[PDB]
Structure 1
Amino acid sequence: SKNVVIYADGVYDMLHLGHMKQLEQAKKLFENTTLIVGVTSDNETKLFKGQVVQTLEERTETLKHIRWVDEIISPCPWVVTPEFLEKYKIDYVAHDEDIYAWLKRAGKFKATQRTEGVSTTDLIVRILKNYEDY
């Protein structure tokens, strides 16, 4: 079947299994896909969302090693526009008032899911529990 261009964006700070499973899900939405991953800039992420440990260059370099990632746009725009989708010939946007209503209206919204309890910060908590409060 025809190749389908999928776009997923995010911060991808401290990349963990949860991110990887979400990228896998986006890559597998159709039989033959090109998965483009957008990595948000350092300044926009901190201004609008919150703190980031790794720089754009670090977060991008790590994603390059993930088998589902076909292309990376780094930095990506903070807000997806219809002209952005036109410019990169994106067929669907994958991700987890409604600022995405236009995407759904256009038939280009594909839902993916988050995995709880697999984050990098979750592992640090596990390490700490070897140390009894008393």
Structure 2
Amino acid sequence: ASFERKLITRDALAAMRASLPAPVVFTNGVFDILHRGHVSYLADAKALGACLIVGVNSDASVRMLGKGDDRPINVQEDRMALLAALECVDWVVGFDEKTPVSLIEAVHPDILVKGGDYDMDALPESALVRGWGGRALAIPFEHDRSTTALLKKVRAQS
């Protein structure tokens, strides 16, 4: 229950914003079932900055899109709790709207990241963040990294 210290409300995160370590990194998603691409990317996003905030679609909100799952099999509190259990995540915030734009406006990240192959120029939130001089970028889900090759290289040795 200790990782639950990361679950926070938009209002509380807004009050705390000024005291967060720069650069503040933001990402959002449904995160219905965590897989390795999710955590690999959650870790790299953390590595870009000093602080990582994850926005999580409410159950109603998730119902707003036809892209992914209309109805997530895990309730928003459970999806958020899993994220909070992660070493690389600092803060987990839910949002109800269909897009994370007003959440992002409130949070004011220095860096916005998306996991997957997504044209960042087609995203409203990219424009929002770049609008005040921040950065927006897509981090691929599974890519061959130097840190991976190395650590496992280490594994064979045994």
Q: Under a length normalisation based on structure 1, what TM-score does the superposition of the two structures give?
A: 0.70
Equivalence for 2:122: 98
Unaligned 5+ segments in structure 1 are 117-134
Q: Which moved more, 1:40-49 or 1:100-109?
A: 100-109
How many residues of Structure 1 are paired with residues of Structure 2 in the alignment? 112
RMSD across aligned positions (CA): 2.5
**Cα distance, 1:11–1:29 mapped onto 2, change above 3 Å:** same
State how far apart, in whole Å, the 2-side matches of 1:55 and 1:11 are.
10
The residue type paired with residue 102 of structure 1 is A
The 8 Å contact of residues 3 and 34 in structure 1, kept in 2 or not, is answered as yes
Runs (5+) with no aligned partner, structure 2: 1-20, 116-120, 144-158
Change in Cα spacing, 1:38 to 1:47, as seen in structure 2 (3 Å) is same
1:7 has 2:34 as partner: no
Instruction: Give distance in 1, aligned partners of 2:61 and 2:96.
Output: 10
CA distance in 1, matches of 2:99, 2:64: 13
* Mapping of residues 84-95 of structure 1, within 5 Å: 84-95=103-114
- Answer yes or no: is 1:75 the counterpart of 2:102: no
**Equivalent residue, structure 1, for 2:54:** 37
Higher helix proportion (structure 1 or 2): 2
Q: Is the 8 A contact 1:9 1:37 kept in 2?
A: yes
Where has structure 1 moved over 6 Å in runs of 4 or more? none
2:139 to 105, 112, 127: 112
For normalisation by structure 2, the TM-score amounts to 0.60
